Amino acid sequence: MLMPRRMKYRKQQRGRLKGATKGGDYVAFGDYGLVALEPAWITAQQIEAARVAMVRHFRRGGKIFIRIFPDKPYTKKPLEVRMGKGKGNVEGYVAVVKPGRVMFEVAGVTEEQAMEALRIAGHKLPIKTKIVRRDAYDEAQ
Amino acid sequence: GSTRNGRDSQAKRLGVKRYEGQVVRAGNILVRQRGTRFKPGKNVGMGRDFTLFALVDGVVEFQDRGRLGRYVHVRPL
Amino acid sequence: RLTAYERRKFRVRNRIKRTGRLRLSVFRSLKHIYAQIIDDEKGVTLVSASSLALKLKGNKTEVARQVGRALAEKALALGIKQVAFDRGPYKYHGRVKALAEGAREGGLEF
Amino acid sequence: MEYRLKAYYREGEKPSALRRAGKLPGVMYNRHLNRKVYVDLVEFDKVFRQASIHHVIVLELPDGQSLPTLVRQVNLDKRRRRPEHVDFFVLSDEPVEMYVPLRFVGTPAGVRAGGVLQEIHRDILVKVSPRNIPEFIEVDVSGLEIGDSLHASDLKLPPGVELAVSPEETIAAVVPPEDVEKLAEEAAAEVAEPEVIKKGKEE
Amino acid sequence: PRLKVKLVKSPIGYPKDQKAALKALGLRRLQQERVLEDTPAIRGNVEKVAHLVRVEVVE
RNA sequence: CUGACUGGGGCCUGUAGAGCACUGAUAGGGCUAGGGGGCCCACCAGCCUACCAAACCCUGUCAAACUCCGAAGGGUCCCAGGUGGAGCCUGGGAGUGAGGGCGCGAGCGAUAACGUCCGCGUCCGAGCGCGGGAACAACCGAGACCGCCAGCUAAGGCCCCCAAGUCUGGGCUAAGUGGUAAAGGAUGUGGCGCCGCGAAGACAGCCAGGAGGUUGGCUUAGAAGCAGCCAUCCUUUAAAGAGUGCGUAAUAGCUCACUGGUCGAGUGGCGCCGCGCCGAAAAUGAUCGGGGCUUAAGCCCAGCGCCGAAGCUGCGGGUCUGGG
RNA sequence: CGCCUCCUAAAAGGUAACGGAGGCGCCCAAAGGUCCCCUCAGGCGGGACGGAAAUCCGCCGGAGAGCGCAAGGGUAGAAGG
RNA sequence: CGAUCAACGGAUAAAAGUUACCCCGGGGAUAACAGGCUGAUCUCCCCCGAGCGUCCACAGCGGCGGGGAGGUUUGGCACCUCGAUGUCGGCUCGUCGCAUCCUGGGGCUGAAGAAGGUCCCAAGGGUUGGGCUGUUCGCCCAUUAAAGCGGCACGCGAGCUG
RNA sequence: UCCCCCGUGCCCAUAGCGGCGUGGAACCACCCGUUCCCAUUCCGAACACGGAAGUGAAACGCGCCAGCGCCGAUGGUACUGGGCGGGCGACCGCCUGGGAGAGUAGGUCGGUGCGGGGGA
Ligand SMILES: NC(=[NH2+])NCCC[C@H](N)C(=O)O
Ligand SMILES: [Mg+2]
Ligand SMILES: [Mg+2]
Ligand SMILES: [Mg+2]
Ligand SMILES: [Mg+2]
Ligand SMILES: [Mg+2]
Ligand SMILES: [Mg+2]
Ligand SMILES: [Mg+2]
Ligand SMILES: [Mg+2]
Ligand SMILES: [Mg+2]
Ligand SMILES: [Mg+2]
Ligand SMILES: [Mg+2]
Ligand SMILES: [Mg+2]
Ligand SMILES: [Mg+2]
Ligand SMILES: [Mg+2]
Ligand SMILES: [Mg+2]
Ligand SMILES: [Mg+2]
Ligand SMILES: [Mg+2]
Ligand SMILES: [Mg+2]
Ligand SMILES: [Mg+2]
Ligand SMILES: [Mg+2]
Ligand SMILES: [Mg+2]
Ligand SMILES: [Mg+2]
Ligand SMILES: [Mg+2]
Ligand SMILES: [Mg+2]
Ligand SMILES: [Mg+2]
Ligand SMILES: [Mg+2]
Ligand SMILES: [Mg+2]
Ligand SMILES: [Mg+2]
Ligand SMILES: [Mg+2]
Ligand SMILES: [Mg+2]
Ligand SMILES: [Mg+2]
Ligand SMILES: [Mg+2]
Ligand SMILES: [Mg+2]
Ligand SMILES: [Mg+2]
Ligand SMILES: [Mg+2]
Ligand SMILES: [Mg+2]
Ligand SMILES: [Mg+2]
Ligand SMILES: [Mg+2]
Ligand SMILES: [Mg+2]
Ligand SMILES: [Mg+2]
Ligand SMILES: [Mg+2]
Ligand SMILES: [Mg+2]
Ligand SMILES: [Mg+2]
Ligand SMILES: [Mg+2]
Ligand SMILES: [Mg+2]
Ligand SMILES: [Mg+2]
Ligand SMILES: [Mg+2]
Ligand SMILES: [Mg+2]
Ligand SMILES: [Mg+2]
Ligand SMILES: [Mg+2]
Ligand SMILES: [Mg+2]
Ligand SMILES: [Mg+2]
Ligand SMILES: [Mg+2]
Ligand SMILES: [Mg+2]
Ligand SMILES: [Mg+2]
Ligand SMILES: [Mg+2]
Ligand SMILES: [Mg+2]
Ligand SMILES: [Mg+2]
Ligand SMILES: [Mg+2]
Ligand SMILES: [Mg+2]
Ligand SMILES: [Mg+2]
Ligand SMILES: [Mg+2]
Ligand SMILES: [Mg+2]
Ligand SMILES: [Mg+2]
Ligand SMILES: [Mg+2]
Ligand SMILES: [Mg+2]
Ligand SMILES: [Mg+2]
Ligand SMILES: [Mg+2]
Ligand SMILES: [Mg+2]
Ligand SMILES: [Mg+2]
Ligand SMILES: [Mg+2]
Ligand SMILES: [Mg+2]
Ligand SMILES: [Mg+2]
Ligand SMILES: [Mg+2]
Ligand SMILES: [Mg+2]
Ligand SMILES: [Mg+2]
Ligand SMILES: [Mg+2]
Ligand SMILES: [Mg+2]
Ligand SMILES: [Mg+2]
Ligand SMILES: [Mg+2]
Ligand SMILES: [Mg+2]
Ligand SMILES: [Mg+2]
Ligand SMILES: [Mg+2]
Ligand SMILES: [Mg+2]
Ligand SMILES: [Mg+2]
Ligand SMILES: [Mg+2]
Ligand SMILES: [Mg+2]
Ligand SMILES: [Mg+2]
Ligand SMILES: [Mg+2]
Ligand SMILES: [Mg+2]
Ligand SMILES: [Mg+2]
Ligand SMILES: [Mg+2]
Ligand SMILES: [Mg+2]
Ligand SMILES: [Mg+2]
Ligand SMILES: [Mg+2]
Ligand SMILES: [Mg+2]
Ligand SMILES: [Mg+2]
Ligand SMILES: [Mg+2]
Ligand SMILES: [Mg+2]
Ligand SMILES: [Mg+2]
Ligand SMILES: [Mg+2]
Ligand SMILES: [Mg+2]
Ligand SMILES: [Mg+2]
Ligand SMILES: [Mg+2]
Ligand SMILES: [Mg+2]
Ligand SMILES: [Mg+2]
Ligand SMILES: [Mg+2]
Ligand SMILES: [Mg+2]
Ligand SMILES: [Mg+2]
Ligand SMILES: [Mg+2]
Ligand SMILES: [Mg+2]
Ligand SMILES: [Mg+2]
Ligand SMILES: [Mg+2]
Ligand SMILES: [Mg+2]
Ligand SMILES: [Mg+2]
Ligand SMILES: [Mg+2]
Ligand SMILES: [Mg+2]
Ligand SMILES: [Mg+2]
Ligand SMILES: [Mg+2]
Ligand SMILES: [Mg+2]
Ligand SMILES: [Mg+2]
Ligand SMILES: [Mg+2]
Ligand SMILES: [Mg+2]
Ligand SMILES: [Mg+2]
Ligand SMILES: [Mg+2]
Ligand SMILES: [Mg+2]
Ligand SMILES: [Mg+2]
Ligand SMILES: [Mg+2]
Ligand SMILES: [Mg+2]
Ligand SMILES: [Mg+2]
Ligand SMILES: [Mg+2]
Ligand SMILES: [Mg+2]
Ligand SMILES: [Mg+2]
Ligand SMILES: [Mg+2]
Ligand SMILES: [Mg+2]
Ligand SMILES: [Mg+2]
Ligand SMILES: [Mg+2]
Ligand SMILES: [Mg+2]
Ligand SMILES: [Mg+2]
Ligand SMILES: [Mg+2]
Ligand SMILES: [Mg+2]
Ligand SMILES: [Mg+2]
Ligand SMILES: [Mg+2]
Ligand SMILES: [Mg+2]
Ligand SMILES: [Mg+2]
Ligand SMILES: [Mg+2]
Ligand SMILES: [Mg+2]
Ligand SMILES: [Mg+2]
Ligand SMILES: [Mg+2]
Ligand SMILES: [Mg+2]
Ligand SMILES: [Mg+2]
Ligand SMILES: [Mg+2]
Ligand SMILES: [Mg+2]
Ligand SMILES: [Mg+2]
Ligand SMILES: [Mg+2]
Ligand SMILES: [Mg+2]
Ligand SMILES: [Mg+2]
Ligand SMILES: [Mg+2]
Ligand SMILES: [Mg+2]
Ligand SMILES: [Mg+2]
Ligand SMILES: [Mg+2]
Ligand SMILES: [Mg+2]
Ligand SMILES: [Mg+2]
Ligand SMILES: [Mg+2]
Ligand SMILES: [Mg+2]
Ligand SMILES: [Mg+2]
Ligand SMILES: [Mg+2]
Ligand SMILES: [Mg+2]
Ligand SMILES: [Mg+2]
Ligand SMILES: [Mg+2]
Ligand SMILES: [Mg+2]
Ligand SMILES: [Mg+2]
Ligand SMILES: [Mg+2]
Ligand SMILES: [Mg+2]
Ligand SMILES: [Mg+2]
Ligand SMILES: [Mg+2]
Ligand SMILES: [Mg+2]
Ligand SMILES: [Mg+2]
Ligand SMILES: [Mg+2]
Ligand SMILES: [Mg+2]
Ligand SMILES: [Mg+2]
Ligand SMILES: [Mg+2]
Ligand SMILES: [Mg+2]
Ligand SMILES: [Mg+2]
Ligand SMILES: [Mg+2]
Ligand SMILES: [Mg+2]
Ligand SMILES: [Mg+2]
Ligand SMILES: [Mg+2]
Ligand SMILES: [Mg+2]
Ligand SMILES: [Mg+2]
Ligand SMILES: [Mg+2]
Ligand SMILES: [Mg+2]
Ligand SMILES: [Mg+2]
Ligand SMILES: [Mg+2]
Ligand SMILES: [Mg+2]
Ligand SMILES: [Mg+2]
Ligand SMILES: [Mg+2]
Ligand SMILES: [Mg+2]
Ligand SMILES: [Mg+2]
Ligand SMILES: [Mg+2]
Ligand SMILES: [Mg+2]
Ligand SMILES: [Mg+2]
Ligand SMILES: [Mg+2]
Ligand SMILES: [Mg+2]
Ligand SMILES: [Mg+2]
Ligand SMILES: [Mg+2]
Ligand SMILES: [Mg+2]
Ligand SMILES: [Mg+2]
Ligand SMILES: [Mg+2]
Ligand SMILES: [Mg+2]
Ligand SMILES: [Mg+2]
Ligand SMILES: [Mg+2]
Ligand SMILES: [Mg+2]
Ligand SMILES: [Mg+2]
Ligand SMILES: [Mg+2]
Ligand SMILES: [Mg+2]
Ligand SMILES: [Mg+2]
Ligand SMILES: [Mg+2]
Ligand SMILES: [Mg+2]
Ligand SMILES: [Mg+2]
Ligand SMILES: [Mg+2]
Ligand SMILES: [Mg+2]
Ligand SMILES: [Mg+2]
Ligand SMILES: [Mg+2]
Ligand SMILES: [Mg+2]
Ligand SMILES: [Mg+2]
Ligand SMILES: [Mg+2]
Ligand SMILES: [Mg+2]
Ligand SMILES: [Mg+2]
Ligand SMILES: [Mg+2]
Ligand SMILES: [Mg+2]
Ligand SMILES: [Mg+2]
Ligand SMILES: [Mg+2]
Ligand SMILES: [Mg+2]
Ligand SMILES: [Mg+2]
Ligand SMILES: [Mg+2]
Ligand SMILES: [Mg+2]
């Protein structure tokens, strides 16, 4: 599943989740999109579960666009150790997601199909979501 | 479990020491820096560690000359 | 993209300007040779001399010398004594050297 | 075809106040003029959804004027996904750079074989006269297989309109579909753990 | 033109530079009023502690 | 008179935000070295790639140790305000060198801890003195010299316990929600918008009909609209998908969409906001502090009045400092 | 466990944790002073042996090379040759 | 000029262990018990509906993911207690919770009946004797309507055992 | 004080790349030579000297062109000093003062000082 092929640094500070998305807020490829209503660290496994849910629904046909990437290493100390002795080990990767982000887009599929696939995908994610359709507003971006 | 980090060096207290319009005496250090972030201008010398300092009594003046760099001048009083 | 000529010029001139003396610049064409004494602090020329202006004639070296002597005479008239030689892109040699020597014979200080 | 939208002049009114009153703040400009305006949000929305940045919107000003415009820019509220501002570009007799809708005529052979038509550009950037704005530009995609592509060079352009992007710019492509039969290989696909770029004496 | 400044809300809990502004204005007790000349330097301290203070323009 | 703080002016800065020009990351597409693979050759070349892909370009993004950009602020100097239990100089005497809570900014931790470690601020410490918060060092209010059976306020309050409104006007809630929780679920209720379909008679019900090629094919062992696909084409039509679901071992059958009739005015599906409902199990006896409260004594918007402290005022007194 | 560089570090300075990453305990008789001269990496095309890369030629190429060694700053109008 | 005085502001020119035979001064400034805060871990309950179940997503199940509750596990933290809060297990004596083992009442069933499965209501009462082992737990023997799980300082040593 | 050229500064790409055109009387350059001064890790390419037949081909100067590069508003937004609220939290808002970056409109094929030589 998704993770950087390589990196400059093994571990990242945690940082913050203030604000609406920096960018990525308009449908840019497909006909429909899944937009983030709440901030979260979205894991690579969450992203993949969402993906697989959509291709499983489509069976054959359609195209999925995954517009977020988990490049942020997630860290956890080995179980039952005390505080100190350095930063925990990298256990996984997450994509930072803030409200308004279009996480996924679909194309090549009917409206009924896209609505349903994106719904099922949403249930795999730790945040509230909204289904949207490409607009003149998107096109003008 | 342990760390192979934990090192850092002493802070070097670099930067401009006398800002534009300040009255300095000859020898007064004007800038501590690595390399020439500022270049010596009129009545300003430069030491082996890029330290800018006033060659005369006077008033400090800065000047940004684009691609030619930022300069520090001293204007005689 | 600068040229060897342009770099060489900047290099020797920058060094001169740091000392803050009046600057004796010398231009040497295939035919003529020119000198102006420059105040780089006001960005103004103080006194000038050339083979083209003096209608000098003969051997380029002997000419250079003469324009040097000439520049000196006019310079001393304005109270200009000490100066710094700006050979620019030219080697200190031949025509430029001659002009320099002619300037010195006139009592220009350098 | 051509749309009409009542606009109004604004001076010092706070954008927030206007927006809370259901008014969409905006600006209209060109090399000759620059004016702060506002339009009724829902009225604007009815228009823009049809007109987009493609079709001319003439603004009926309160001083009796009527200026032909193109929407140059719409600023979206990133959180709420809503327009918060409009740039109206006031047209004049000069040629103008603008976006013209691409209309994809035909069903790609690739699509019949199960593929998907990715419409990379849904409009194309073009210089043209305001008097000359076409409504669309057709493209024949029925020849495209999985995975073939069309470029802006393959665009057959109507009279008086000139491509304003590189002919190299790709405008459509026909891609392979999603397939569950691939899921299993992807799931049992092992990834090599990330390599960390060497610092220091190691490069 | 002058400013009548009344201290109406306590500086306890507020940053020390606001406490100092009050001292520059000569305001030391709650409900205390001072009539100060309207100069930018004074206006600057009055505005700094506006949330503590009640201002009126006088004469 | 130099102080904290403040006005103006100049200089210094690389954070917030943003961006992708550099260092790296990055999905897709295009283009295109390099391989994998397939045709075709050992005669050394050719052709095809829904294969993994470098560089490049496009669209779209990511970054404490990235920056083409870049604030608010912050720092410092000058002039001016600033007479303060301000400042500077010399010297005598210390104590302290276990801090803690809270707000904001980060790191560590698990977008844990009455956690831990720094930064800016604050309060407790030392204000466990006073009012509010049921009770409660650090939340809100406020810096207690003494006295008064006087007045005004703060936060918080004004149905009774309990001082002051069972105060006034508009709305919402029916859950005692108020008076502890989430994904998620729902013809709870209300307000806005958006659509359709309707007196070319809709929706609901009740009436019929709902059909041929055709048990259609990639197609396999049953596959007859209703076990996967890379299929949906037409015929007779008023109408009827090569089919909504129930159904069958497949069949058949029921039904939908569907068109006609019967009634005669609305009907169905979206979306945005307010308040509620479920989701909601833990150990001695319960409870919003209690009583008790429903056009509230709840929630939202707008008001007038009052109560309320050791704050402020009135009156009297002390002491120190300053001025007479 | 001292020292250097970057980040954490909240755009002056400073700032902690058994926080995130790397270095030093040398070296150079020139790798020092000065005067003079010179300008890179890389891409493309061309050239016996010669190759992805040896040396040569042309064009483009502001600095992405170089600067003994970590990192940062600086730097060709040289600190590089 | 002689310093890996590198524990790098460098105690001597010169230095390792052990104490369950231990001792004093102190600390709840700091660990082990219990409590507390937290809930990663643990236990339980949900959301999604891939797929299983001859046929049929939901009788019984529930891929990949998502949200919680509890405070019985193992921990994190170090907040009262180190001028003492006796720590496992048993016995005795109970009492409470309910996520119910049985008995009572229900819905669904892939419920013919009988017997089950699964969920809902329900804490009134009940929930055996024995072999092993310090055991808690667990395995086993013989039964049973059933042989429930947890809290009470892992309830209870000024009640006993040890 | 006007136009052209030659020097030399300043602003520091609105000045740059590319394309095209233009200039030799003057000036500048290439150029003609390598005796002499001086010079090449080889080379008169460079540096240097002595020249004056030729050419503005190269370079340079001066125009024009917006393909690139560079510059770039006004609006609106993010963010925020100070002041307030809300959420159990991740976080979300209001007031006042400040206010980007991206992008859009558009701008740009330089401007200017001093001294020379020439022209009117
Ligand atoms: N200086 C300011 N006004 N800052 C505004 C930020 C404050 C607050 N977080 C808000 O979003 O409104
Ligand atoms: Mg952190
Ligand atoms: Mg997580
Ligand atoms: Mg972590
Ligand atoms: Mg441990
Ligand atoms: Mg750690
Ligand atoms: Mg960790
Ligand atoms: Mg993970
Ligand atoms: Mg995001
Ligand atoms: Mg979700
Ligand atoms: Mg964009
Ligand atoms: Mg180590
Ligand atoms: Mg460290
Ligand atoms: Mg160290
Ligand atoms: Mg440090
Ligand atoms: Mg330091
Ligand atoms: Mg440092
Ligand atoms: Mg500085
Ligand atoms: Mg020196
Ligand atoms: Mg040096
Ligand atoms: Mg200045
Ligand atoms: Mg000066
Ligand atoms: Mg709208
Ligand atoms: Mg090294
Ligand atoms: Mg206060
Ligand atoms: Mg006070
Ligand atoms: Mg307060
Ligand atoms: Mg303040
Ligand atoms: Mg301050
Ligand atoms: Mg007071
Ligand atoms: Mg007031
Ligand atoms: Mg004073
Ligand atoms: Mg001062
Ligand atoms: Mg001061
Ligand atoms: Mg000030
Ligand atoms: Mg940021
Ligand atoms: Mg980048
Ligand atoms: Mg871009
Ligand atoms: Mg970030
Ligand atoms: Mg960023
Ligand atoms: Mg940083
Ligand atoms: Mg940054
Ligand atoms: Mg800028
Ligand atoms: Mg500033
Ligand atoms: Mg300041
Ligand atoms: Mg200032
Ligand atoms: Mg003063
Ligand atoms: Mg005094
Ligand atoms: Mg004092
Ligand atoms: Mg004092
Ligand atoms: Mg004393
Ligand atoms: Mg004493
Ligand atoms: Mg002490
Ligand atoms: Mg002491
Ligand atoms: Mg100590
Ligand atoms: Mg201490
Ligand atoms: Mg302590
Ligand atoms: Mg501390
Ligand atoms: Mg501490
Ligand atoms: Mg805090
Ligand atoms: Mg707050
Ligand atoms: Mg904080
Ligand atoms: Mg930090
Ligand atoms: Mg603490
Ligand atoms: Mg905390
Ligand atoms: Mg914390
Ligand atoms: Mg504190
Ligand atoms: Mg104490
Ligand atoms: Mg207090
Ligand atoms: Mg205090
Ligand atoms: Mg107290
Ligand atoms: Mg009390
Ligand atoms: Mg209290
Ligand atoms: Mg109280
Ligand atoms: Mg009370
Ligand atoms: Mg309290
Ligand atoms: Mg407390
Ligand atoms: Mg108190
Ligand atoms: Mg007092
Ligand atoms: Mg009153
Ligand atoms: Mg009040
Ligand atoms: Mg009350
Ligand atoms: Mg009463
Ligand atoms: Mg009231
Ligand atoms: Mg009433
Ligand atoms: Mg209820
Ligand atoms: Mg209640
Ligand atoms: Mg309740
Ligand atoms: Mg919900
Ligand atoms: Mg509902
Ligand atoms: Mg509702
Ligand atoms: Mg109905
Ligand atoms: Mg069939
Ligand atoms: Mg049938
Ligand atoms: Mg509930
Ligand atoms: Mg009412
Ligand atoms: Mg009172
Ligand atoms: Mg008092
Ligand atoms: Mg009195
Ligand atoms: Mg007194
Ligand atoms: Mg006194
Ligand atoms: Mg720092
Ligand atoms: Mg820093
Ligand atoms: Mg700093
Ligand atoms: Mg700072
Ligand atoms: Mg200092
Ligand atoms: Mg350590
Ligand atoms: Mg080391
Ligand atoms: Mg040498
Ligand atoms: Mg040498
Ligand atoms: Mg090369
Ligand atoms: Mg080659
Ligand atoms: Mg070869
Ligand atoms: Mg080669
Ligand atoms: Mg370099
Ligand atoms: Mg020794
Ligand atoms: Mg070591
Ligand atoms: Mg030591
Ligand atoms: Mg030692
Ligand atoms: Mg040492
Ligand atoms: Mg030491
Ligand atoms: Mg030290
Ligand atoms: Mg010693
Ligand atoms: Mg010793
Ligand atoms: Mg000895
Ligand atoms: Mg020893
Ligand atoms: Mg020793
Ligand atoms: Mg011993
Ligand atoms: Mg022993
Ligand atoms: Mg022993
Ligand atoms: Mg023994
Ligand atoms: Mg013994
Ligand atoms: Mg003994
Ligand atoms: Mg013994
Ligand atoms: Mg003993
Ligand atoms: Mg003892
Ligand atoms: Mg002792
Ligand atoms: Mg003792
Ligand atoms: Mg303790
Ligand atoms: Mg200690
Ligand atoms: Mg302990
Ligand atoms: Mg313990
Ligand atoms: Mg303990
Ligand atoms: Mg323990
Ligand atoms: Mg334990
Ligand atoms: Mg215990
Ligand atoms: Mg414990
Ligand atoms: Mg206890
Ligand atoms: Mg307890
Ligand atoms: Mg707890
Ligand atoms: Mg929990
Ligand atoms: Mg919990
Ligand atoms: Mg857990
Ligand atoms: Mg649950
Ligand atoms: Mg379900
Ligand atoms: Mg099956
Ligand atoms: Mg079934
Ligand atoms: Mg299925
Ligand atoms: Mg289920
Ligand atoms: Mg599961
Ligand atoms: Mg969870
Ligand atoms: Mg869980
Ligand atoms: Mg517990
Ligand atoms: Mg426990
Ligand atoms: Mg523990
Ligand atoms: Mg525990
Ligand atoms: Mg522990
Ligand atoms: Mg403790
Ligand atoms: Mg403790
Ligand atoms: Mg502590
Ligand atoms: Mg103890
Ligand atoms: Mg005792
Ligand atoms: Mg005791
Ligand atoms: Mg005792
Ligand atoms: Mg005792
Ligand atoms: Mg029990
Ligand atoms: Mg129950
Ligand atoms: Mg039962
Ligand atoms: Mg039963
Ligand atoms: Mg039965
Ligand atoms: Mg049976
Ligand atoms: Mg049953
Ligand atoms: Mg039930
Ligand atoms: Mg019972
Ligand atoms: Mg009972
Ligand atoms: Mg029981
Ligand atoms: Mg038994
Ligand atoms: Mg026996
Ligand atoms: Mg036994
Ligand atoms: Mg046993
Ligand atoms: Mg036994
Ligand atoms: Mg056992
Ligand atoms: Mg066994
Ligand atoms: Mg039996
Ligand atoms: Mg039974
Ligand atoms: Mg228990
Ligand atoms: Mg326990
Ligand atoms: Mg235990
Ligand atoms: Mg016990
Ligand atoms: Mg027990
Ligand atoms: Mg016990
Ligand atoms: Mg005992
Ligand atoms: Mg016992
Ligand atoms: Mg006892
Ligand atoms: Mg006892
Ligand atoms: Mg007892
Ligand atoms: Mg006892
Ligand atoms: Mg016993
Ligand atoms: Mg024993
Ligand atoms: Mg010129
Ligand atoms: Mg050009
Ligand atoms: Mg020509
Ligand atoms: Mg030309
Ligand atoms: Mg000529
Ligand atoms: Mg001619
Ligand atoms: Mg010779
Ligand atoms: Mg000769
Ligand atoms: Mg030659
Ligand atoms: Mg030459
Ligand atoms: Mg000749
Ligand atoms: Mg030419
Ligand atoms: Mg030249
Ligand atoms: Mg132009
Ligand atoms: Mg710029
Ligand atoms: Mg811009
Ligand atoms: Mg603006
Ligand atoms: Mg704020
Ligand atoms: Mg926060
Ligand atoms: Mg905000
Ligand atoms: Mg604002
Ligand atoms: Mg403002
Ligand atoms: Mg900005
Ligand atoms: Mg801008
Ligand atoms: Mg240009
Ligand atoms: Mg010029
Ligand atoms: Mg000038
Ligand atoms: Mg002129
Ligand atoms: Mg002239």
DSSP codes of every residue in B23-73: EE-TT-EEEE-SS-SSEE-TTEEE-TT--EEESSSEEEEEEE-GGG-EEEE
Q: Where are the alpha helices (DSSP H) in A14-110?
A: 44-58
Nearest to A139 among D77, D122, D191 (CB): D122
CB-based touch A/D (3+ pairs, under 8 A): yes
Question: Domain ranges in chain E?
Answer: 1-59
Subunits with 3+ Cβ pairs within 8 Å of B are A
Task: Identify the residues numbered 40 to 99 in chain A whose C-beta atom is closer than 7 Å to any atom of strand F.
Answer: 40-41, 59-61, 65-69, 71-72, 74-77, 83-84, 86-88, 96
- For A78, other C-beta atoms within 10 Å of its C-beta total 10
Q: Do A60 and D78 make contact, defined as CB atoms within 8 angstroms?
A: no
DSSP assignment string, chain D: --EEEEEEE-SS--HHHHHHTTEEEEEEE-SS-EEEEEEEHHHHHHHHHHHTTTS-EEEE-TTS-EEEEEEEEEEEETTTTEEEEEEEEE--SS-EEEEEEEEEES--HHHHTT-EEE-S-SEEEEEE-GGG--S-EEEE-TT--TT-EEEGGG--PPTT-EE-S-TT-EEEEEEPPPBGGGHHHHHS---PPPEEPP-TT--
- Within the 37-96 window of chain A, which residues sit less than 8 Å (CB to CB) from chain B? 78, 81, 85-86
CATH number at residue A61: 3.90.1170.10
Residue in chain A nearest B1 by alpha carbon = A85
DSSP A11-24: --------SS-SS-
- What nucleotides of chain I have any atom within 7 angstroms of a protein Cβ? 6-13, 27-31, 37-38, 46-52, 73-80, 82-84, 90-95, 103-107, 113-117
Provide the β-strand partners of residue D120. Answer: none
Interatomic separation, CA of residue E10 and C1' of nucleotide F131, rounded (Å): 15
Count of structural domains within chain A: 1
| B71 contacts B41 by C-beta, under 8 angstroms | yes
Q: Is A38 near strand I, with its CB below 7 A from some atom of it? A: yes
Ligand 147: centre distance to CA A81 (Å): 16
Round to a whole number and report the distance in Å from the CA of B69 to the C1' of G80.
20
CATH code of the region E1-59:
3.30.1390.20
Helix (H) or strand (E) holding C94: helix C94-105
Nearest C-alpha neighbor of A55 from the set D119, A47, D191 = A47
CA gap D71, D69 in Å, rounded: 7
- How many C-beta atoms lie closer than 10 Å to residue D99's C-beta? 19
Bridge partners (DSSP) listed for residue C35: C26, C49
Nearest to A31 by CA among A127, A91, A90, A113: A113
Domain presence at residue A10: no
CB pairs under 8 A between A and D: 97
Domain-located, residue A6: no
Question: How far is CA B31 from each of CA B23, B41, B46, D181, rounded to the nearest angstrom?
Answer: 14, 12, 9, 68
CA angle at residue C59 from C53 to C60, to 5 degrees? 60
Spatial separation of the C-alpha atoms in residues D174 and D148, rounded to whole Å: 6
* Helix (H), strand (E) at residue C33: strand C33-39
Extract the tokens encoding C14.
């920058």
Q: What DSSP character marks residue A115? A: H
State the nearest Cα–Cα gap between A9 and chain B, in angstroms. Answer: 14
Neighbours of B69 (CB within 10 A): 13
CATH fold for domain B13-77:
OB fold (Dihydrolipoamide Acetyltransferase, E2P) (2.40.50)
- Strands (E) across A16-141 are located at 32-36, 40-43, 63-66, 72-76, 89-97, 102-107, 129-133
Domain regions of chain B by residue span: 13-77
The CA-based diameter of chain B, rounded to the nearest angstrom, is 64
Chain D hits for A6, CB-CB cut-off 8 Å, are 194-197
CB contact under 8 A, A62 and D178: yes
Does a structural domain hold residue A21? no
CA distance D183 to chain A (A): 7
Q: CB B2 to CB A85 under 8 A?
A: yes
How many Å apart are CA D42 and CA D47, to the nearest integer?
Answer: 9
For C37-86, the three-class secondary structure string (H helix, E strand, C coil) is EEECCCCEEEEEEEHHHHCCCCCHHHHHHHHHHHHHHHHHHCCCCECEEE
Residue C23 tokens, joined: 């600057």
**Computed from CA positions of residues D30, D32, D37, D40, in that sequence, does the dihedral angle turn out positive or negative?**
negative
Taken in order D145, D146, D152, D158, is the CA torsion positive or negative? positive
Return d(Cα C81, Cα C37) in angstroms, integer: 11
| Residue of A8, A99, A108 with shortest CB distance to D79 | A99
- Which of chain A's residues 84-113 bind strand H, using a 7 Å CB cutoff? 84
Domain membership of residue A109 as a residue range: 29-137
Name the residue of chain B whose CA is nearest to A88's CA: B1
Phi first, then psi: what are they for D3, rounded to 5°?
Answer: -120, 155
Instruction: Write phi, then psi, for E46 (nearest 5 degrees).
Output: -65, -40
Please check whether strand I approaches the CB of C53 to within 7 Å. yes
Residue at A34 is within a domain: yes
Cβ density class C48-60: b for 16+ within 10 Å, e for less: bbbbeeeebeeeb
- Identify which of D76, D116, D194 has the shortest CB distance to residue A3: D194
The rounded distance, in Å, linking the Cα atoms of D139 and D152 is: 10
The CA-based dihedral angle spanning residues A85, A87, A89, A91, taken in that order and rounded to the nearest 10 degrees: 140
Q: How far is A82 from chain B (nearest CA, A)?
A: 11
> What's the CA gap between B22 and B14, in Å, rounded?
18
* Nearest nt (C1') from A46 Cα: H65
Pairwise CA distance, residues D139 & D174, whole Å: 14
Q: Quick check: B2 and A78 CB within 8 A?
A: no
B21 Cα: distance to centroid of ligand 191 (angstroms): 97
Nearest residue, CA→C1' of G72 = B34
Decide: helix, strand or coil at residue A112.
helix
Name residue, tokens 């004469």. Answer: E59
Torsion, CA A24, CA A27, CA A28, CA A31, rounded to 10: 150
Is residue A24 a part of any domain in this protein?
no
In angstroms, the separation between the Cα of residue A84 and the nearest Cα of chain B is 9
Give the Cα separation of D49 and D101 in Å (integer). 14
Check: CB of residue E20 under 8 Å from CB of residue E28. no
Which chain A residue has the Cα nearest residue B6? A86
Q: Name which of C67, C74, C72, C65 is nearest C94 in CA terms.
A: C65
